[PDB]
Amino acid sequence: QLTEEQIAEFKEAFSLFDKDGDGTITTKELGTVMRSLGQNPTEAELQDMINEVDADGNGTIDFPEFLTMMASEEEIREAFRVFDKDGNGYISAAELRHVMTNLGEKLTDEEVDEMIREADIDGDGQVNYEEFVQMMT
Amino acid sequence: KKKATFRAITSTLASSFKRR
Ligand SMILES: [Ca+2]
Ligand SMILES: [Ca+2]
Ligand SMILES: [Ca+2]
Ligand SMILES: [Ca+2]
């Protein structure tokens, strides 16, 4: 049972996927998101991704089902490489900004800095792989 | 704030990689 703050936070995340704002994430919307992250899932894999979390079997992710879902090493490495575009071992504010922009979310530099700060543990102002793992685990 | 967003993206990536 999450907090009001956290729900609002996840609502913000959910909105990155729901491109038409109709309160439902479709396979087409998930596909758009995934391609904006450098991936190319097939129609079937997109259905599968939706199926794992779909409570009412209606084809799409609504907001409750999105939250439930948010309940391996190679998977985390592969995801880190999406953000760490120059492969230097650190996700910079600029790299995070780029990814968010391509997702259709134009953040101010302060908002980009706060997102990094939340994940940064050593306080060098970037996210390394170990900090990234911790964020997820 | 957007650590949920940063997490959501990462999780969704992890999901996609799973079914390779
Ligand atoms: Ca939608
Ligand atoms: Ca549904
Ligand atoms: Ca980098
Ligand atoms: Ca750091």
mmCIF file of C-alpha atoms and ligand atoms in Angstrom:
data_model
loop_
_atom_site.group_PDB
_atom_site.id
_atom_site.type_symbol
_atom_site.label_atom_id
_atom_site.label_comp_id
_atom_site.label_asym_id
_atom_site.label_seq_id
_atom_site.Cartn_x
_atom_site.Cartn_y
_atom_site.Cartn_z
ATOM 1 C CA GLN A 1 0.000 0.000 0.000
ATOM 2 C CA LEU A 2 1.913 3.022 -1.395
ATOM 3 C CA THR A 3 1.862 6.705 -0.383
ATOM 4 C CA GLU A 4 -0.007 9.588 -2.041
ATOM 5 C CA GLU A 5 3.396 10.972 -3.093
ATOM 6 C CA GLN A 6 4.423 7.649 -4.647
ATOM 7 C CA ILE A 7 1.117 7.159 -6.494
ATOM 8 C CA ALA A 8 1.462 10.654 -7.996
ATOM 9 C CA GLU A 9 5.003 9.660 -8.975
ATOM 10 C CA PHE A 10 3.838 6.501 -10.677
ATOM 11 C CA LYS A 11 1.010 8.440 -12.344
ATOM 12 C CA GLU A 12 3.785 10.563 -13.862
ATOM 13 C CA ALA A 13 5.565 7.403 -15.058
ATOM 14 C CA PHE A 14 2.326 5.931 -16.385
ATOM 15 C CA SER A 15 1.738 9.114 -18.421
ATOM 16 C CA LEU A 16 5.033 8.517 -20.354
ATOM 17 C CA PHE A 17 3.439 5.385 -21.835
ATOM 18 C CA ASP A 18 -0.154 6.586 -22.239
ATOM 19 C CA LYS A 19 0.601 8.838 -25.251
ATOM 20 C CA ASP A 20 -3.063 9.706 -26.012
ATOM 21 C CA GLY A 21 -3.949 10.413 -22.349
ATOM 22 C CA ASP A 22 -6.991 8.102 -22.487
ATOM 23 C CA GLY A 23 -5.968 6.269 -19.317
ATOM 24 C CA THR A 24 -4.947 3.062 -21.089
ATOM 25 C CA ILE A 25 -1.582 1.820 -22.382
ATOM 26 C CA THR A 26 -1.956 0.004 -25.675
ATOM 27 C CA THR A 27 0.510 -2.297 -27.400
ATOM 28 C CA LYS A 28 1.096 0.466 -29.955
ATOM 29 C CA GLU A 29 1.937 2.898 -27.167
ATOM 30 C CA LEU A 30 4.274 0.414 -25.488
ATOM 31 C CA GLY A 31 5.920 -0.212 -28.831
ATOM 32 C CA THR A 32 6.458 3.500 -29.368
ATOM 33 C CA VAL A 33 8.084 3.738 -25.914
ATOM 34 C CA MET A 34 10.293 0.765 -26.507
ATOM 35 C CA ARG A 35 11.520 2.009 -29.869
ATOM 36 C CA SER A 36 12.232 5.448 -28.319
ATOM 37 C CA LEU A 37 14.627 3.374 -26.004
ATOM 38 C CA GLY A 38 16.414 1.744 -28.919
ATOM 39 C CA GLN A 39 14.446 -1.529 -28.748
ATOM 40 C CA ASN A 40 12.357 -3.279 -31.414
ATOM 41 C CA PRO A 41 9.946 -5.720 -29.847
ATOM 42 C CA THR A 42 7.611 -7.639 -32.157
ATOM 43 C CA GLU A 43 3.855 -7.341 -32.074
ATOM 44 C CA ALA A 44 3.777 -10.672 -30.194
ATOM 45 C CA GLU A 45 6.343 -9.621 -27.592
ATOM 46 C CA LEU A 46 4.439 -6.447 -26.947
ATOM 47 C CA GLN A 47 1.228 -8.474 -26.332
ATOM 48 C CA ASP A 48 3.223 -10.726 -24.038
ATOM 49 C CA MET A 49 4.604 -7.759 -22.056
ATOM 50 C CA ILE A 50 1.049 -6.462 -21.607
ATOM 51 C CA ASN A 51 -0.355 -9.947 -20.806
ATOM 52 C CA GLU A 52 1.972 -10.395 -17.794
ATOM 53 C CA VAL A 53 0.359 -7.473 -16.017
ATOM 54 C CA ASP A 54 -3.168 -7.319 -17.485
ATOM 55 C CA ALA A 55 -5.767 -7.864 -14.798
ATOM 56 C CA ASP A 56 -9.059 -7.573 -16.706
ATOM 57 C CA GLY A 57 -7.778 -9.209 -19.866
ATOM 58 C CA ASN A 58 -8.880 -6.225 -21.928
ATOM 59 C CA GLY A 59 -5.704 -5.850 -23.995
ATOM 60 C CA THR A 60 -4.290 -2.792 -22.249
ATOM 61 C CA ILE A 61 -2.610 -1.586 -18.985
ATOM 62 C CA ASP A 62 -4.705 0.825 -16.863
ATOM 63 C CA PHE A 63 -3.214 2.565 -13.863
ATOM 64 C CA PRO A 64 -3.804 -0.041 -11.146
ATOM 65 C CA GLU A 65 -2.190 -2.754 -13.295
ATOM 66 C CA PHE A 66 0.784 -0.465 -13.978
ATOM 67 C CA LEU A 67 1.413 -0.111 -10.225
ATOM 68 C CA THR A 68 1.163 -3.816 -9.413
ATOM 69 C CA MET A 69 3.849 -4.540 -11.971
ATOM 70 C CA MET A 70 6.255 -2.193 -10.209
ATOM 71 C CA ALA A 71 6.361 -4.751 -7.362
ATOM 72 C CA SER A 72 18.691 -10.538 -13.638
ATOM 73 C CA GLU A 73 22.157 -9.069 -13.896
ATOM 74 C CA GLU A 74 22.305 -9.132 -17.694
ATOM 75 C CA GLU A 75 18.897 -7.413 -17.847
ATOM 76 C CA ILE A 76 20.108 -4.597 -15.614
ATOM 77 C CA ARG A 77 23.373 -4.211 -17.581
ATOM 78 C CA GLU A 78 21.490 -4.012 -20.851
ATOM 79 C CA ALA A 79 19.205 -1.336 -19.415
ATOM 80 C CA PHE A 80 22.139 0.662 -18.018
ATOM 81 C CA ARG A 81 23.658 0.734 -21.525
ATOM 82 C CA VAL A 82 20.493 2.420 -22.819
ATOM 83 C CA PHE A 83 21.177 5.421 -20.571
ATOM 84 C CA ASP A 84 24.969 5.323 -20.628
ATOM 85 C CA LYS A 85 25.178 6.282 -24.305
ATOM 86 C CA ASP A 86 28.913 6.979 -24.424
ATOM 87 C CA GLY A 87 29.652 3.820 -22.496
ATOM 88 C CA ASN A 88 31.849 5.632 -19.966
ATOM 89 C CA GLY A 89 30.336 3.876 -17.001
ATOM 90 C CA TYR A 90 28.341 6.801 -15.656
ATOM 91 C CA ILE A 91 24.923 8.115 -16.497
ATOM 92 C CA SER A 92 25.249 11.860 -16.697
ATOM 93 C CA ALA A 93 22.483 14.453 -16.338
ATOM 94 C CA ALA A 94 22.875 15.098 -20.104
ATOM 95 C CA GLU A 95 22.423 11.386 -20.898
ATOM 96 C CA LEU A 96 19.326 11.157 -18.679
ATOM 97 C CA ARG A 97 17.959 14.350 -20.327
ATOM 98 C CA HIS A 98 18.431 12.832 -23.759
ATOM 99 C CA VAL A 99 16.605 9.671 -22.892
ATOM 100 C CA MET A 100 13.725 11.520 -21.281
ATOM 101 C CA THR A 101 13.469 13.895 -24.231
ATOM 102 C CA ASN A 102 13.229 11.049 -26.703
ATOM 103 C CA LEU A 103 10.440 9.602 -24.458
ATOM 104 C CA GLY A 104 8.657 12.900 -25.013
ATOM 105 C CA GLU A 105 9.353 14.502 -21.638
ATOM 106 C CA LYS A 106 11.264 17.846 -21.956
ATOM 107 C CA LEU A 107 12.686 18.375 -18.441
ATOM 108 C CA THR A 108 14.393 21.495 -17.117
ATOM 109 C CA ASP A 109 18.013 21.004 -16.068
ATOM 110 C CA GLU A 110 16.916 21.252 -12.409
ATOM 111 C CA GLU A 111 14.369 18.447 -12.825
ATOM 112 C CA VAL A 112 17.095 16.358 -14.559
ATOM 113 C CA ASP A 113 19.490 17.056 -11.717
ATOM 114 C CA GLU A 114 16.920 16.008 -9.058
ATOM 115 C CA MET A 115 16.297 12.688 -10.850
ATOM 116 C CA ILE A 116 20.051 11.988 -10.857
ATOM 117 C CA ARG A 117 20.379 13.096 -7.236
ATOM 118 C CA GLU A 118 17.741 10.570 -6.172
ATOM 119 C CA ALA A 119 19.739 7.705 -7.690
ATOM 120 C CA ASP A 120 23.234 9.030 -6.845
ATOM 121 C CA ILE A 121 24.695 7.448 -3.705
ATOM 122 C CA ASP A 122 28.364 8.546 -3.690
ATOM 123 C CA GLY A 123 27.392 12.121 -4.502
ATOM 124 C CA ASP A 124 29.596 12.536 -7.607
ATOM 125 C CA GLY A 125 26.507 13.852 -9.454
ATOM 126 C CA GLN A 126 26.256 10.840 -11.842
ATOM 127 C CA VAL A 127 24.803 7.322 -11.676
ATOM 128 C CA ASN A 128 27.253 4.479 -11.944
ATOM 129 C CA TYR A 129 26.361 0.829 -12.516
ATOM 130 C CA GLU A 130 26.266 -0.150 -8.859
ATOM 131 C CA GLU A 131 23.989 2.804 -8.002
ATOM 132 C CA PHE A 132 21.851 1.808 -10.938
ATOM 133 C CA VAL A 133 21.578 -1.756 -9.649
ATOM 134 C CA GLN A 134 20.564 -0.491 -6.203
ATOM 135 C CA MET A 135 17.969 1.711 -7.678
ATOM 136 C CA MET A 136 16.390 -1.447 -9.140
ATOM 137 C CA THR A 137 16.998 -3.938 -6.444
ATOM 138 C CA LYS B 1 10.033 12.422 -7.553
ATOM 139 C CA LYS B 2 11.017 10.899 -10.866
ATOM 140 C CA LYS B 3 12.995 7.911 -9.449
ATOM 141 C CA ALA B 4 9.666 6.093 -10.117
ATOM 142 C CA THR B 5 10.026 7.286 -13.719
ATOM 143 C CA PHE B 6 13.695 6.276 -13.866
ATOM 144 C CA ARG B 7 12.709 2.885 -12.334
ATOM 145 C CA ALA B 8 9.696 2.412 -14.630
ATOM 146 C CA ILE B 9 11.811 2.821 -17.717
ATOM 147 C CA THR B 10 14.415 0.440 -16.433
ATOM 148 C CA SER B 11 11.872 -2.191 -15.405
ATOM 149 C CA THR B 12 10.138 -1.995 -18.769
ATOM 150 C CA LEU B 13 13.499 -2.511 -20.444
ATOM 151 C CA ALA B 14 14.239 -5.486 -18.201
ATOM 152 C CA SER B 15 10.806 -6.944 -19.188
ATOM 153 C CA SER B 16 11.634 -6.728 -22.888
ATOM 154 C CA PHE B 17 15.041 -8.360 -22.484
ATOM 155 C CA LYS B 18 13.494 -11.214 -20.483
ATOM 156 C CA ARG B 19 11.582 -12.682 -23.464
ATOM 157 C CA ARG B 20 14.522 -12.796 -25.924
HETATM 158 CA CA CA C 1 -3.559 5.478 -24.306
HETATM 159 CA CA CA C 2 -6.495 -3.808 -18.508
HETATM 160 CA CA CA C 3 27.982 8.099 -19.857
HETATM 161 CA CA CA C 4 27.253 8.582 -8.258
#
